[PDB]
Design an enzyme around this catalytic site. Sequence first.
Site, mmCIF file in Angstrom:
data_model
loop_
_atom_site.group_PDB
_atom_site.id
_atom_site.type_symbol
_atom_site.label_atom_id
_atom_site.label_comp_id
_atom_site.label_asym_id
_atom_site.label_seq_id
_atom_site.Cartn_x
_atom_site.Cartn_y
_atom_site.Cartn_z
ATOM 1 N N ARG A 1 20.643 65.657 -34.820
ATOM 2 C CA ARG A 1 20.617 66.367 -36.105
ATOM 3 C C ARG A 1 20.610 67.914 -36.055
ATOM 4 O O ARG A 1 21.430 68.577 -36.703
ATOM 5 C CB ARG A 1 19.852 65.674 -37.266
ATOM 6 N N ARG B 1 16.170 62.141 -42.681
ATOM 7 C CA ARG B 1 17.269 61.612 -41.874
ATOM 8 C C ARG B 1 17.007 61.796 -40.382
ATOM 9 O O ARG B 1 17.087 62.915 -39.855
ATOM 10 C CB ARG B 1 18.602 62.214 -42.281
ATOM 11 N N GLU C 1 29.697 62.372 -53.812
ATOM 12 C CA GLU C 1 29.669 62.034 -52.403
ATOM 13 C C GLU C 1 31.065 61.606 -51.897
ATOM 14 O O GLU C 1 31.748 60.798 -52.507
ATOM 15 C CB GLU C 1 28.526 61.019 -52.085
ATOM 16 N N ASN D 1 34.264 59.734 -38.870
ATOM 17 C CA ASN D 1 33.988 59.833 -40.278
ATOM 18 C C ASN D 1 33.153 61.085 -40.517
ATOM 19 O O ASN D 1 32.136 61.288 -39.855
ATOM 20 C CB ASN D 1 33.142 58.610 -40.736
ATOM 21 N N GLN E 1 31.123 63.004 -43.619
ATOM 22 C CA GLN E 1 30.766 62.888 -45.025
ATOM 23 C C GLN E 1 30.405 64.198 -45.682
ATOM 24 O O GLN E 1 29.780 65.046 -45.056
ATOM 25 C CB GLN E 1 29.572 62.006 -45.316
ATOM 26 N N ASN F 1 29.992 60.828 -37.774
ATOM 27 C CA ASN F 1 29.774 59.685 -36.924
ATOM 28 C C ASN F 1 30.813 59.690 -35.821
ATOM 29 O O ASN F 1 32.009 59.551 -36.104
ATOM 30 C CB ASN F 1 29.775 58.385 -37.727
ATOM 31 N N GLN G 1 21.826 17.204 -40.208
ATOM 32 C CA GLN G 1 20.463 17.633 -40.033
ATOM 33 C C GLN G 1 19.450 16.506 -40.113
ATOM 34 O O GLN G 1 19.468 15.707 -41.036
ATOM 35 C CB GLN G 1 20.131 18.788 -40.961
ATOM 36 N N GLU H 1 19.890 16.369 -44.326
ATOM 37 C CA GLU H 1 21.125 16.583 -45.047
ATOM 38 C C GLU H 1 22.352 16.592 -44.154
ATOM 39 O O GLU H 1 22.255 16.651 -42.932
ATOM 40 C CB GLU H 1 21.080 17.894 -45.858
HETATM 41 N N1 LIG Z 1 20.431 66.393 -49.173
HETATM 42 C C1 LIG Z 1 20.575 65.234 -49.644
HETATM 43 N N2 LIG Z 1 20.259 64.920 -50.936
HETATM 44 C C2 LIG Z 1 20.410 63.691 -51.540
HETATM 45 N N3 LIG Z 1 20.895 62.639 -50.935
HETATM 46 C C3 LIG Z 1 21.224 62.885 -49.645
HETATM 47 C C4 LIG Z 1 21.094 64.091 -48.974
HETATM 48 N N4 LIG Z 1 21.548 63.957 -47.687
HETATM 49 C C5 LIG Z 1 21.940 62.683 -47.593
HETATM 50 N N5 LIG Z 1 21.748 61.971 -48.730
HETATM 51 C C6 LIG Z 1 22.012 60.541 -48.965
HETATM 52 O O1 LIG Z 1 21.580 59.828 -47.856
HETATM 53 C C7 LIG Z 1 22.604 58.925 -47.363
HETATM 54 C C8 LIG Z 1 22.472 58.720 -45.846
HETATM 55 O O2 LIG Z 1 22.850 59.888 -45.061
HETATM 56 P P1 LIG Z 1 23.541 59.638 -43.626
HETATM 57 O O3 LIG Z 1 23.586 60.920 -42.835
HETATM 58 O O4 LIG Z 1 24.933 59.098 -43.783
HETATM 59 O O5 LIG Z 1 22.709 58.563 -42.811
HETATM 60 P P2 LIG Z 1 23.257 57.635 -41.653
HETATM 61 O O6 LIG Z 1 22.147 56.645 -41.388
HETATM 62 O O7 LIG Z 1 23.532 58.516 -40.465
HETATM 63 N N6 LIG Z 1 24.620 56.857 -42.118
HETATM 64 P P3 LIG Z 1 25.468 55.711 -41.387
HETATM 65 O O8 LIG Z 1 25.675 56.175 -39.857
HETATM 66 O O9 LIG Z 1 26.824 55.595 -41.967
HETATM 67 O O10 LIG Z 1 24.778 54.340 -41.480
HETATM 68 C C9 LIG Z 1 23.926 59.496 -47.870
HETATM 69 O O11 LIG Z 1 24.929 58.473 -48.018
HETATM 70 C C10 LIG Z 1 23.504 60.280 -49.129
HETATM 71 O O12 LIG Z 1 23.779 59.563 -50.343
HETATM 72 N N1 LIG Z 2 11.464 16.806 -46.206
HETATM 73 C C1 LIG Z 2 11.472 17.809 -45.456
HETATM 74 N N2 LIG Z 2 10.475 17.999 -44.564
HETATM 75 C C2 LIG Z 2 10.366 19.063 -43.704
HETATM 76 N N3 LIG Z 2 11.225 20.042 -43.634
HETATM 77 C C3 LIG Z 2 12.274 19.872 -44.475
HETATM 78 C C4 LIG Z 2 12.442 18.835 -45.381
HETATM 79 N N4 LIG Z 2 13.580 19.033 -46.116
HETATM 80 C C5 LIG Z 2 14.107 20.163 -45.638
HETATM 81 N N5 LIG Z 2 13.309 20.764 -44.724
HETATM 82 C C6 LIG Z 2 13.421 22.125 -44.226
HETATM 83 O O1 LIG Z 2 14.103 22.887 -45.165
HETATM 84 C C7 LIG Z 2 15.303 23.464 -44.562
HETATM 85 C C8 LIG Z 2 16.404 23.634 -45.596
HETATM 86 O O2 LIG Z 2 16.799 22.357 -46.131
HETATM 87 P P1 LIG Z 2 18.385 22.145 -46.348
HETATM 88 O O3 LIG Z 2 18.661 20.947 -47.194
HETATM 89 O O4 LIG Z 2 19.054 21.951 -45.034
HETATM 90 O O5 LIG Z 2 18.965 23.441 -47.045
HETATM 91 P P2 LIG Z 2 20.431 24.013 -47.036
HETATM 92 O O6 LIG Z 2 20.462 25.245 -47.927
HETATM 93 O O7 LIG Z 2 21.378 22.946 -47.514
HETATM 94 N N6 LIG Z 2 20.789 24.489 -45.549
HETATM 95 P P3 LIG Z 2 22.198 24.884 -44.870
HETATM 96 O O8 LIG Z 2 23.381 24.152 -45.670
HETATM 97 O O9 LIG Z 2 22.126 24.326 -43.482
HETATM 98 O O10 LIG Z 2 22.414 26.381 -44.796
HETATM 99 C C9 LIG Z 2 15.616 22.582 -43.359
HETATM 100 O O11 LIG Z 2 16.322 23.299 -42.332
HETATM 101 C C10 LIG Z 2 14.200 22.173 -42.940
HETATM 102 O O12 LIG Z 2 13.594 23.190 -42.146
HETATM 103 K K LIG Z 3 25.848 61.447 -37.023
HETATM 104 K K LIG Z 4 26.588 57.377 -52.673
HETATM 105 MN MN LIG Z 5 23.191 22.481 -46.536
HETATM 106 MN MN LIG Z 6 25.692 58.542 -39.416
HETATM 107 MN MN LIG Z 7 20.348 22.776 -43.911
#
Ligand SMILES: Nc1ncnc2c1ncn2[C@@H]1O[C@H](COP(=O)(O)OP(=O)(O)NP(=O)(O)O)[C@@H](O)[C@H]1O
Ligand SMILES: Nc1ncnc2c1ncn2[C@@H]1O[C@H](COP(=O)(O)OP(=O)(O)NP(=O)(O)O)[C@@H](O)[C@H]1O
Ligand SMILES: [K+]
Ligand SMILES: [K+]
Ligand SMILES: [Mn+2]
Ligand SMILES: [Mn+2]
Ligand SMILES: [Mn+2]
Lengths: 1073, 379
Positions: free
Chosen positions: A129, A169, A215, A283, A285, A301, A829, A841
């Site tokens: 920075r 930052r 921005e 990039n 900004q 960046n 499952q 399921e």
């Molecule tokens: N002086 C300032 N006043 C208000 N907002 C600000 C200011 N400086 C930065 N920001 C906001 O803060 C955000 C983050 O700043 P940034 O430097 O891009 O962080 P970063 O973590 O390095 N980004 P990234 O690498 O893309 O995940 C920006 O997108 C702005 O909207």
């Molecule tokens: N009867 C039960 N007893 C114990 N644990 C259960 C039971 N029913 C479900 N679970 C838990 O609940 C979780 C989520 O149930 P699930 O029906 O698989 O959801 P889902 O949103 O359909 N999942 P997915 O499609 O795999 O992203 C399972 O991974 C188990 O950890």
């Molecule tokens: K940077």
């Molecule tokens: K913004």
């Molecule tokens: Mn499911």
């Molecule tokens: Mn950055």
């Molecule tokens: Mn599931």
Amino acid sequence: MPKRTDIKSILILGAGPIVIGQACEFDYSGAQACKALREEGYRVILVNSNPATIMTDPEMADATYIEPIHWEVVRKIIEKERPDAVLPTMGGQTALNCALELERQGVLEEFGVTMIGATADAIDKAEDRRRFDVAMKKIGLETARSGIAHTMEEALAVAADVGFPCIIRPSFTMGGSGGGIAYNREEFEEICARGLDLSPTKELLIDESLIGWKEYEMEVVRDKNDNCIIVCSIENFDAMGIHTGDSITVAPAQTLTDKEYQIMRNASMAVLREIGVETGGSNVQFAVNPKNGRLIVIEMNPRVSRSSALASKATGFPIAKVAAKLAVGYTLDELMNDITGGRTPASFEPSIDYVVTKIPRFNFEKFAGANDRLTTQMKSVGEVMAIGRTQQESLQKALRGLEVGATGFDPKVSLDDPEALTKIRRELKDAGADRIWYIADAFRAGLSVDGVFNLTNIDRWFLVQIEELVRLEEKVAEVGITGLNADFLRQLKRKGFADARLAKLAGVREAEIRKLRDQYDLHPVYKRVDTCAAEFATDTAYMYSTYEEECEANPSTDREKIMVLGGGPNRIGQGIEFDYCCVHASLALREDGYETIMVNCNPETVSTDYDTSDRLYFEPVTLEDVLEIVRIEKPKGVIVQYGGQTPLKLARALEAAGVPVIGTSPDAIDRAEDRERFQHAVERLKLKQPANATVTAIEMAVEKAKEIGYPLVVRPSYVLGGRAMEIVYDEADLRRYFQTAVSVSNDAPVLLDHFLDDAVEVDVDAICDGEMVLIGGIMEHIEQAGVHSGDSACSLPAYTLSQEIQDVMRQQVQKLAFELQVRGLMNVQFAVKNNEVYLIEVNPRAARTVPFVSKATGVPLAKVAARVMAGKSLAEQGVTKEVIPPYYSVKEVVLPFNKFPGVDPLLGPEMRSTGEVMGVGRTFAEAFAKAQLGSNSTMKKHGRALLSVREGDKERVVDLAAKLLKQGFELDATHGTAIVLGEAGINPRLVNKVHEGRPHIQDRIKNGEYTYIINTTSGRRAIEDSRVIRRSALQYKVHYDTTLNGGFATAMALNADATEKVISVQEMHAQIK
Amino acid sequence: IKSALLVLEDGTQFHGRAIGATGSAVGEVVFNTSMTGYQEILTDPSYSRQIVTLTYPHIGNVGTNDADEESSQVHAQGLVIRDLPLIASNFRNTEDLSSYLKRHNIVAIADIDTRKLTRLLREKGAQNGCIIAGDNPDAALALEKARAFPGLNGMDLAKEVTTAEAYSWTQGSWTLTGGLPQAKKEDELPFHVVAYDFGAKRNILRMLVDRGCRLTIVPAQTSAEDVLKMNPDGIFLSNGPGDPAPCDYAITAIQKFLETDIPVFGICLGHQLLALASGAKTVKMKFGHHGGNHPVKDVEKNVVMITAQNHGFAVDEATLPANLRVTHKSLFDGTLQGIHRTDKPAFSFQGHPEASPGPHDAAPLFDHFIELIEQYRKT
Ligand SMILES: Nc1ncnc2c1ncn2[C@@H]1O[C@H](COP(=O)(O)OP(=O)(O)NP(=O)(O)O)[C@@H](O)[C@H]1O
Ligand SMILES: Nc1ncnc2c1ncn2[C@@H]1O[C@H](COP(=O)(O)OP(=O)(O)NP(=O)(O)O)[C@@H](O)[C@H]1O
Ligand SMILES: [K+]
Ligand SMILES: [K+]
Ligand SMILES: [Mn+2]
Ligand SMILES: [Mn+2]
Ligand SMILES: [Mn+2]
Ligand SMILES: CC[N+](CC)(CC)CC
Ligand SMILES: NCCC[C@H](N)C(=O)O
Ligand SMILES: [Cl-]
Ligand SMILES: [Cl-]
Ligand SMILES: [Cl-]
Ligand SMILES: [Cl-]
Ligand SMILES: [K+]
Ligand SMILES: [K+]
């Protein structure tokens, strides 16, 4: 020179597990580089712990390493692969950071690895920075009134300078990680505390406030000859103060005069030059004072970013591809423009004849107690992108392409709600993820553009646009379906209105509008992306829909087409796994002779890459949108099984509308997706499922609950990731979570399932070709049933389950495959309790475990299943026997709790993880240790451990305590735990709860007394009681386990060395006989 | 509802909306890929008798301002855009686009498929067309007028836009902070350049003045003799509309300057004229070059630069006199972009080193000219 000679082998640094602020962008980036070099005769070696990425496809690179991304580990890779150069710019912060530590630790030096793309000084020059700021001033650019802080005392003094509000930052962070807006002193310490700790360089950059200024971002690429170009410019919708990653943004910039653009552009180049970037793209900004054009540089960046992916998809300019090539000394003029059939050089600035819009995708609903206001630290999990000839068109498409249930501007508040203006006010004043919809509500409510601008700071150029759509909407509402003449309807289609929105407004059915459109001959045309605004022809078919005159679709009549529907924006529960599957299906079928068509609008994906399929429709995955393409493509078949819940929900409607859906049927999908239907299937099969009932209303639910008995799991229909799922302990627990379950159930019933205590969870991925069933893999979970599969760690092979019992499951899978008419992939499952298999399921599609299992077994399931779907049997493919690898493979997840501090970092039935890593070992222990380390766990092999377990875990705790002791740990425990341990002969050191005295756990944790924490809970209240250990453990970066099985696994890992030995995927696969 | 219609020579119709003055407009239709700088583009004299189509859909987002005028008026014959924004939103704005167009009495249409139009022109090359804006525009009449268009081929337009009486320019370039500066006092300007006005952009002048020249603008038809008589430290040949070919007078005169040791510089047309005067040939391109993203290579340094282009004609490379050496080429189509006299102190650029609008990349082309001048002064 042309491509370099002294470099033959290149090591590409991947970015690790997907996390908030550091997502799919890199897989897209990474994979671009990989392909770029390889196409360029280079040995490519790349390391990535993430199994779900494409980049880790063994056929992608010469040497693929799915290893923890630790410099020690990376060291061993270098040592073993003897790479020439290292490309550390395609993996986000993880990569930069690693490249730098390799360098720090003299590992690069040690083996003669040349650092390419960007040098370590350049990187530091930007990542640092103070340094950055110093450069700005040297080249005369302006920056925000700041100061640097290395301490709290120092941060305090700079704050007492710049004033509040102020912007924190840190150096060597991104995604606004460890940053934020200090509006007061209290906020100030908390943010700084975090940043300082978070900072790799222990340094913060404190700024004054530019909140509300415009921005902008620019994507530049520079070559060795000094040639420089702006690939894309971006104007943010949401003003300074809301991280770009959490903002709606558009390309190109819209409200700068040529004169301001040029200034910005020159500055952008000035900045790359000053910093040292010579062989890539970066990039830059900026902030602009709308009132006066005053320009301020925000940062740079020195690598690829998320905007590069977006910028790339927006222009058709292959940033990462180009940059890679540039790093091996290629020059822009040398490189050809991909999309224009290499007719023109890559040395040019793209020009676009449309408007690109990107909207972030959030998951606040999964993180209740979180702060859901948008700020300078990223909170989003994904993003959608849309293309339209106009901004209105662009924006609306994006709204509907987001998959949050919107048809466009659906209303948030009622018109006849007295408090409505007040809610609107708030939502506008303090942005939430819902802002865009509230802005429309504000117009409906009587607020002026000015009134809105004042609260939002969003440029009126955008605002008026939204107000105009509202007015058009009110007209539709007045005139209704009768007023929908062709002229008007046409005008409506042109402003991006969806049939579905028009339908609600006209109080008719969506299918009616679509019909009306038919009558009128009102269909969109397709334009193509070409980087040049039509100045040159393109032979690529990268298109977007619009309502205009000329169509550029020019569909084949030539071949048999296969349509793959994408997953839309990434989100918790549906991420990169689904892209990987899509990519493979295309790769497969294409190879098989089919013309492949991709429908998706996630920019950070490889699937939305023009190389990927024959045809690419960069469109929202909706019924309307898909029907239109189908109408013109007239495909052989459509796959709805590889893009998550989306296309899954669309199935019925598609088929019903004449779409030729391939693979598992829509009725079949519904048998599995509908909980009552699934329940029957189990019954009809004479299979075992818990005590349960399917319900639609509370009263009845309540009644049924009495029957089933608590505790019980609430499981809605048509969801993945455990959306709205919850474990209920009593009636009132029930009444509180019931509606929510219903709201997401899709007009399908909510299951009430009796909770299965002390049961093991198992996942099974298989393929059914109607002839036979192929078992891909059986994965045993570490965390017990009750902890979502997606949040559990897992092992392949199973590490504790009897063969006898696994065999019982293989059969159930087969029985199910056949009864359900599965055609392609399926995921099963189960829960094992008392040597009894229980069915939880069936997921009638490709699951998130697919990429991992493939990687673990060496069998490309997505490819195979894709072929089966298209007609080719398992027999024919010669993929008929289940693979059981020689090594162990363990999957571990990464959780976002550190982004949402006000959240209790507890695990449960609802999935919350954002990513995952893969650990491969000679043993389960070796596998786990590797998984645990790659998951970025802070675990140590020594120290003091804190034990605080629930009643049920009182038996196994002794064994655990013992095991830690044999390892050299020193124990501490709370009251009850201490009692039991004492009885076993183990005498922990007593520790006071928070209500007990002082010092207490919090104090001790906070002091850094501990290196491990094992804390298990049980019951709503007992959970809320122990929340502080968890929250503190997190804040202080101490490894903690919330399951005993979790702890046991950790324990085992203690007997292994994750840095010991490394193995390529090619080599793992070769060990399979 | 206010109609407008654009008809191409080939019979192709574009129906849309009227956004400027009422009436008709006829010219050669061209497409411009610039995303910004529409006003600067409008007030560019080289656009005279041309109906300009912009590829970037939203045109008018920043409104208009006087500083963004490259000439005293709008030269474009017509304006063809995809979408006219609801509002103008820029601090520099003084008048919304519509108003401005009307005020300049420009017939303009909106809401048409510009992309389809672009592809057409690019595919089948430049065409003349007619835009009719009004109550019931007559498609057959439009066609008629389009069809009836003569053609810029062999059309000397330079004479039509040039200045009546020669004049002096001493004004510098614009600044964000200061805006357009005040004219300088002649005594503050070392060099003294004579400029032929072939329909010159103000930015050329400003940038010159910017480099220490005091200018004297002369009508296109001015005699070399008359010229030489002022003892210029360097001569310059501006940009402008039409065929460069037909401009015998200027050709003749330039020939006369190249007999002397005075440094000479030509931009765009001036480029073509000088090449002509050197016995080279000029062609009329299929669709030409109009944008601000054009890569041009300095063959000599093997360095690329993004430039601002606007030209319907070009100089034939395979007919270049040996005395003529190529300094630059287009990386999009390999066309000739820059030349230098082997023998003389005379060179030129096909594009616009002055931008306005556009990338600043090629501005050093001016510096060469200043070198050439301080050298003739040493002499
Ligand atoms: N002086 C300032 N006043 C208000 N907002 C600000 C200011 N400086 C930065 N920001 C906001 O803060 C955000 C983050 O700043 P940034 O430097 O891009 O962080 P970063 O973590 O390095 N980004 P990234 O690498 O893309 O995940 C920006 O997108 C702005 O909207
Ligand atoms: N009867 C039960 N007893 C114990 N644990 C259960 C039971 N029913 C479900 N679970 C838990 O609940 C979780 C989520 O149930 P699930 O029906 O698989 O959801 P889902 O949103 O359909 N999942 P997915 O499609 O795999 O992203 C399972 O991974 C188990 O950890
Ligand atoms: K940077
Ligand atoms: K913004
Ligand atoms: Mn499911
Ligand atoms: Mn950055
Ligand atoms: Mn599931
Ligand atoms: C971006 C991901 N990390 C920072 C570089 C934090 C998860 C790696 C540990
Ligand atoms: N695989 C889930 C992560 C486990 C976390 N350490 C905890 O035990 O909650
Ligand atoms: Cl200011
Ligand atoms: Cl109407
Ligand atoms: Cl929070
Ligand atoms: Cl049209
Ligand atoms: K589990
Ligand atoms: K039209």
